[PDB]
Write an enzyme that holds these catalytic residues in place. Sequence first.
Site, PDB file in Angstrom:
ATOM      1  N   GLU A   1      26.804  13.545  31.368  1.00  0.00           N
ATOM      2  CA  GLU A   1      28.176  13.632  31.054  1.00  0.00           C
ATOM      3  C   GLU A   1      28.714  14.987  31.553  1.00  0.00           C
ATOM      4  OE1 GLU A   1      29.660  15.469  27.605  1.00  0.00           O
ATOM      5  OE2 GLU A   1      27.820  14.805  26.513  1.00  0.00           O
TER       6      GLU A   1
ATOM      7  N   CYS B   1      25.233  12.054  25.417  1.00  0.00           N
ATOM      8  CA  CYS B   1      23.924  12.563  25.274  1.00  0.00           C
ATOM      9  C   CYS B   1      23.070  11.242  25.681  1.00  0.00           C
ATOM     10  CB  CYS B   1      23.765  12.950  23.909  1.00  0.00           C
ATOM     11  SG  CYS B   1      24.927  14.229  23.944  1.00  0.00           S
TER      12      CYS B   1
ATOM     13  N   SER C   1      31.873  13.842  13.748  1.00  0.00           N
ATOM     14  CA  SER C   1      30.498  14.049  14.446  1.00  0.00           C
ATOM     15  C   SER C   1      29.140  13.861  13.457  1.00  0.00           C
ATOM     16  CB  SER C   1      30.745  15.121  15.522  1.00  0.00           C
ATOM     17  OG  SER C   1      29.711  16.187  14.742  1.00  0.00           O
TER      18      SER C   1
ATOM     19  N   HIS D   1      17.365  12.986  19.559  1.00  0.00           N
ATOM     20  CA  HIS D   1      18.372  13.855  20.324  1.00  0.00           C
ATOM     21  C   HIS D   1      18.584  15.204  19.530  1.00  0.00           C
ATOM     22  CE1 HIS D   1      21.828  15.355  22.437  1.00  0.00           C
ATOM     23  NE2 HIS D   1      22.691  15.318  21.376  1.00  0.00           N
TER      24      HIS D   1
ATOM     25  N   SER E   1      27.788  10.329  21.529  1.00  0.00           N
ATOM     26  CA  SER E   1      29.055  10.295  20.750  1.00  0.00           C
ATOM     27  C   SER E   1      30.089   8.872  21.409  1.00  0.00           C
ATOM     28  CB  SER E   1      29.804  11.505  20.472  1.00  0.00           C
ATOM     29  OG  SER E   1      29.197  12.546  19.822  1.00  0.00           O
TER      30      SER E   1
HETATM   31  C1  LIG Z   1      26.447  13.355  23.295  1.00  0.00           C
HETATM   32  O1  LIG Z   1      26.390  12.046  23.299  1.00  0.00           O
HETATM   33  O2  LIG Z   1      26.362  14.039  24.711  1.00  0.00           O
HETATM   34  C2  LIG Z   1      27.259  14.516  22.564  1.00  0.00           C
HETATM   35  C3  LIG Z   1      26.235  14.919  21.657  1.00  0.00           C
HETATM   36  C4  LIG Z   1      26.734  16.389  21.431  1.00  0.00           C
HETATM   37  O3  LIG Z   1      25.197  15.258  22.460  1.00  0.00           O
HETATM   38  C5  LIG Z   1      26.083  14.171  20.549  1.00  0.00           C
HETATM   39  C6  LIG Z   1      25.312  14.941  19.398  1.00  0.00           C
HETATM   40  O4  LIG Z   1      24.253  15.211  19.697  1.00  0.00           O
HETATM   41  S1  LIG Z   1      25.859  15.291  17.870  1.00  0.00           S
HETATM   42  C7  LIG Z   1      25.127  16.562  17.118  1.00  0.00           C
HETATM   43  C8  LIG Z   1      26.192  17.140  16.019  1.00  0.00           C
HETATM   44  N1  LIG Z   1      27.216  17.754  16.919  1.00  0.00           N
HETATM   45  C9  LIG Z   1      27.290  18.682  17.686  1.00  0.00           C
HETATM   46  O5  LIG Z   1      26.437  19.342  18.605  1.00  0.00           O
HETATM   47  C10 LIG Z   1      28.510  19.261  18.191  1.00  0.00           C
HETATM   48  C11 LIG Z   1      28.654  20.921  18.664  1.00  0.00           C
HETATM   49  N2  LIG Z   1      28.516  21.694  17.432  1.00  0.00           N
HETATM   50  C12 LIG Z   1      29.407  21.606  16.235  1.00  0.00           C
HETATM   51  O6  LIG Z   1      30.326  21.003  16.111  1.00  0.00           O
HETATM   52  C13 LIG Z   1      28.913  22.645  15.328  1.00  0.00           C
HETATM   53  O7  LIG Z   1      28.060  23.414  15.640  1.00  0.00           O
HETATM   54  C14 LIG Z   1      28.791  22.310  13.816  1.00  0.00           C
HETATM   55  C15 LIG Z   1      29.786  21.744  13.086  1.00  0.00           C
HETATM   56  C16 LIG Z   1      27.629  21.080  14.188  1.00  0.00           C
HETATM   57  C17 LIG Z   1      28.136  23.368  12.968  1.00  0.00           C
HETATM   58  O8  LIG Z   1      28.918  24.657  12.958  1.00  0.00           O
HETATM   59  P1  LIG Z   1      29.797  25.028  11.849  1.00  0.00           P
HETATM   60  O9  LIG Z   1      31.168  24.610  11.943  1.00  0.00           O
HETATM   61  O10 LIG Z   1      29.322  26.498  11.826  1.00  0.00           O
HETATM   62  O11 LIG Z   1      29.057  24.363  10.492  1.00  0.00           O
HETATM   63  P2  LIG Z   1      29.401  24.045   8.944  1.00  0.00           P
HETATM   64  O12 LIG Z   1      29.791  22.487   8.843  1.00  0.00           O
HETATM   65  O13 LIG Z   1      30.374  25.197   8.436  1.00  0.00           O
HETATM   66  O14 LIG Z   1      27.940  24.390   8.320  1.00  0.00           O
HETATM   67  C18 LIG Z   1      26.896  24.968   9.135  1.00  0.00           C
HETATM   68  C19 LIG Z   1      25.582  24.870   8.620  1.00  0.00           C
HETATM   69  O15 LIG Z   1      24.987  26.198   8.759  1.00  0.00           O
HETATM   70  C20 LIG Z   1      24.568  26.587   7.495  1.00  0.00           C
HETATM   71  N3  LIG Z   1      24.985  27.896   7.510  1.00  0.00           N
HETATM   72  C21 LIG Z   1      26.169  28.610   7.452  1.00  0.00           C
HETATM   73  N4  LIG Z   1      25.972  29.856   7.254  1.00  0.00           N
HETATM   74  C22 LIG Z   1      24.640  30.005   7.186  1.00  0.00           C
HETATM   75  C23 LIG Z   1      24.072  28.974   7.087  1.00  0.00           C
HETATM   76  N5  LIG Z   1      22.926  28.870   6.873  1.00  0.00           N
HETATM   77  C24 LIG Z   1      21.965  30.127   7.020  1.00  0.00           C
HETATM   78  N6  LIG Z   1      22.548  30.916   6.908  1.00  0.00           N
HETATM   79  C25 LIG Z   1      24.003  31.268   6.959  1.00  0.00           C
HETATM   80  N7  LIG Z   1      24.512  32.417   7.220  1.00  0.00           N
HETATM   81  C26 LIG Z   1      25.496  25.610   6.638  1.00  0.00           C
HETATM   82  O16 LIG Z   1      25.116  25.633   5.139  1.00  0.00           O
HETATM   83  C27 LIG Z   1      25.192  24.246   7.516  1.00  0.00           C
HETATM   84  O17 LIG Z   1      23.853  24.030   7.410  1.00  0.00           O
HETATM   85  P3  LIG Z   1      23.168  23.170   6.017  1.00  0.00           P
HETATM   86  O18 LIG Z   1      21.791  22.869   6.815  1.00  0.00           O
HETATM   87  O19 LIG Z   1      24.154  22.002   5.922  1.00  0.00           O
HETATM   88  O20 LIG Z   1      23.088  23.867   4.957  1.00  0.00           O
END
Ligand SMILES: *C(=O)([O-])[C][C@]([C])([O])[C]C(=O)S[C][C][N]C(=O)[C][C][N]C(=O)[C]([O])C([C])([C])[C]OP(=O)([O-])OP(=O)([O-])O[C][C]1O[C](N2[C]=NC3=C2N=[C]N=C3[N])[C]([O])[C]1OP(=O)([O-])[O-]
Lengths: 450, 450
Positions: free
Chosen positions: A82, A116, A208, A246, A358
């Site tokens: 991709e 992906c 997502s 994945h 996606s």
């Molecule tokens: C394909 O076809 O080619 C496309 C893809 C990309 O291959 C398709 C996919 O595989 S999709 C998989 C999901 N998406 C992605 O990979 C897209 C790229 N990434 C992102 O959008 C971000 O990294 C996401 C939104 C996934 C995460 O980032 P944040 O915005 O920081 O996340 P948030 O919603 O605020 O929650 C984060 C997560 O981390 C936890 N957390 C926060 N602070 C923490 C902590 N954990 C431990 N310690 C600290 N200090 C938070 O609670 C949450 O985790 P939980 O496990 O839910 O508790």
Amino acid sequence: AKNVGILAMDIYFPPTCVQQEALEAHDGASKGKYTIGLGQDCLAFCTELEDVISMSFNAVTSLLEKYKIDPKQIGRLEVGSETVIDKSKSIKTFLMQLFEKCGNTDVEGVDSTNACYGGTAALLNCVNWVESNSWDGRYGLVICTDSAVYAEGPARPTGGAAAIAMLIGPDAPIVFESKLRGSHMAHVYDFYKPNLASEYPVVDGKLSQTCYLMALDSCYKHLCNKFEKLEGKEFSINDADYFVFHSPYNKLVQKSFARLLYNDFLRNASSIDEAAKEKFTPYSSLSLDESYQSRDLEKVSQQLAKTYYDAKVQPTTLVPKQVGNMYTASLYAAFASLVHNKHSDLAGKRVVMFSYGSGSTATMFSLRLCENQSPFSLSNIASVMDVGGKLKARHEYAPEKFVETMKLMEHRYGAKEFVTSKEGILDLLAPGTYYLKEVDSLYRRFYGKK
Amino acid sequence: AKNVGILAMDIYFPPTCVQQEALEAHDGASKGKYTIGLGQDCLAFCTELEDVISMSFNAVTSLLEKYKIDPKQIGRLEVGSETVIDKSKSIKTFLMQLFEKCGNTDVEGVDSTNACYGGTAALLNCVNWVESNSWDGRYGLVICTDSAVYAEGPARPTGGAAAIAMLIGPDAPIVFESKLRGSHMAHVYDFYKPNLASEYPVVDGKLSQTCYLMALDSCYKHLCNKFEKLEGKEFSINDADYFVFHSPYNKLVQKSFARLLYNDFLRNASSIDEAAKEKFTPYSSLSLDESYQSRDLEKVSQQLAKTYYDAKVQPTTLVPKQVGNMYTASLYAAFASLVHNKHSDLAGKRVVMFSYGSGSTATMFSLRLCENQSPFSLSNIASVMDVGGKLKARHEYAPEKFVETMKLMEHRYGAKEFVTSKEGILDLLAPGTYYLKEVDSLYRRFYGKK
Ligand SMILES: *C(=O)([O-])[C][C@]([C])([O])[C]C(=O)S[C][C][N]C(=O)[C][C][N]C(=O)[C]([O])C([C])([C])[C]OP(=O)([O-])OP(=O)([O-])O[C][C]1O[C](N2[C]=NC3=C2N=[C]N=C3[N])[C]([O])[C]1OP(=O)([O-])[O-]
Ligand SMILES: *C(=O)([O-])[C][C@]([C])([O])[C]C(=O)S[C][C][N]C(=O)[C][C][N]C(=O)[C]([O])C([C])([C])[C]OP(=O)([O-])OP(=O)([O-])O[C][C]1O[C](N2[C]=NC3=C2N=[C]N=C3[N])[C]([O])[C]1OP(=O)([O-])[O-]
């Protein structure tokens, strides 16, 4: 053509990387966020010398050599990706460079895209080709290649980059269970790339996740429906030794399996005992638009799932967690580390693979691994791939030097007429890696070896 | 799964067009250049209401309806294109809109790319899928869609635009001769799109012809080698009733067949008589790099070829010549007009198809058409496609109003947050055409019908 699947396999990722802990600090994130939150350790990236073509030459060259394949023996070569370098000229033609000598020009296949998912698209294409009336007896070769690369905000910690090469043929140690699978495809705007000029996706990280699971529930249902017909039983998480996913970051890997587990509840299957039925029970009255949106439920799911996940999912996680999102090659890097880890328990076991892309395009499908004969053995593959070796020859970059490299790649994406800066970098790559030498004024690309 | 190939077929092209004669004048070209030089009559183009998605909905919707196919009966849907709207989100997911209702989400396939070749890539993918252990009994559906669109210089007269839809299945009136084919793939820079932000290719029109024929000679050789094994005879131009070609402009269609003819000489086959052997004979002492570069030889080739070309190639030319380059759908538009013209002579005949894509990826392959049963008949197809009807409901644009539209499409390519200007245009489209209503600020796309 009997027992068709994957005969041999290799991987390549850039040795250049940034420790996730070191980065959290850089970014001013908190102690947990990337190492616990995303559940990631280390993020690999292409610098100016590396791209999806060179990564590709690396994994292809390395497979032919090490499994000792004659490049005349290849009759179909497809690429899933991709990352786009050219809008019309496929990566699969760049790779034709390596057959320009063996004199082998009569090779089917082009590139498959959707996010992906292209790698899986290709994989199936090759299996189906081996099984068709037009099969000429030669091997399939599938390449999954991608560089995952994000803009500043909270998605940058989830880049990664790698190529995987898979040889496809009859009498495979990794046999497709042809009828045991479920796809789900839909028109959807969760992650996409509308911005022709930037490497960076538009990502709606809420959607997502809600769409990833939307697709996983439907694939799993469609696979269960097939399994009833086949084997006479309802599918539970108990019916497969390993689930491979994945792996865009490990957190979502854990919620995915735990969701399978929850699906079992809904269907009231074998793997749901009495204590689980109660834990799950408050959540019976939720809508799906509730089951996806609901944190209490993820929380409860993972906890029941914990010990199974350690049995069935945990050993697929080495490479993703130490490399990052590898887009089309992610699933197959997860599968690779599973072969690295449990290649001895594997004869006679069932691996269930879930591919997601996606936009959206998705497929769960099943493999029976088996006792086979080298070169094409579970042990020879694990040996050849040298995943421990490769993890050992990595070179760290201070978050700084990585942010820098990112700004540099942004200038190179789409551009023309630059020779690439060698010093400090060339000597970081293993003797015999392909690397970008230049891009002329007609955007044509030149690679050297070593 | 027996006699797999194409069961049903439909086409769609924008009704909006510019007469080639009228254009020659506009451009200040000479009396002959486009109508004789390129051998083109009329060039169709997407205005602001049309694109590769809408063209796609048009040809898909129209096929399901008119052959009366239940959209539940589709189990694989692939798209071949080289026009990119999104770098990650495939056209195949946009089309999933139409199955969002029939409830049919379990449909394999994504997009195949390489230049004029993706459609063929897909076609084969679907055939192979029907023939594989994982075939679920439902139909294949292939969509070839593209908008060919060039910058000012001497390549603008060769745009065109259309979608084609092909239903794939056993017991076909159009049967693939599975083993009779030849591909040629290579790394090459004759035509490509490095410029992520523009719709416009970098084209090296000299190389662009020398590589087309390089690939055609190799495909033809590889097909001849197969034919010896199969049928016990050396392949001549005599061994097929019809040759169908990718048709970027008719001139090159004529030099292609005439080259087949020349290939026959080189091999000294059945179709080369004594008078030909002399005509050809001065050119024996040329290198290939000479045979490609040499005008005297094209001149002599076409003249011998003239009368055969009128028999075997001429009736494939209606739609290309009245529409322009249709990229991945070009071959299949040439094949369509062949079915339109000679659907009655066709039972029992052999059609030889040559697919080319720059960069380069190529395949010649063979079809046996036959006596079959409606809906899936040579007559019902020709009827359903209504190629005469469609040519009749076209709307001409003064070269002016076309140059204008071109400048407008250039502003819309890649862009966001514009509603499309309806008046003077909507009412040019047949009741029930899909059209772009808008693009929001998140580049998401909205279509209406009718
Ligand atoms: C394909 O076809 O080619 C496309 C893809 C990309 O291959 C398709 C996919 O595989 S999709 C998989 C999901 N998406 C992605 O990979 C897209 C790229 N990434 C992102 O959008 C971000 O990294 C996401 C939104 C996934 C995460 O980032 P944040 O915005 O920081 O996340 P948030 O919603 O605020 O929650 C984060 C997560 O981390 C936890 N957390 C926060 N602070 C923490 C902590 N954990 C431990 N310690 C600290 N200090 C938070 O609670 C949450 O985790 P939980 O496990 O839910 O508790
Ligand atoms: C795919 O994978 O998606 C990519 C493609 C695009 O689908 C792959 C292909 O199918 S390749 C087919 C070849 N290329 C293209 O379609 C690319 C787009 N077009 C062009 O580059 C130009 O239109 C070309 C170069 C093909 C022609 O344009 P000119 O530059 O004008 O051509 P020139 O070389 O000068 O010769 C033109 C031709 O016309 C004759 N001629 C000139 N003036 C005339 C005239 N004939 C009659 N009357 C007048 N006044 C000239 O002699 C020559 O024709 P001949 O038949 O050789 O005599």
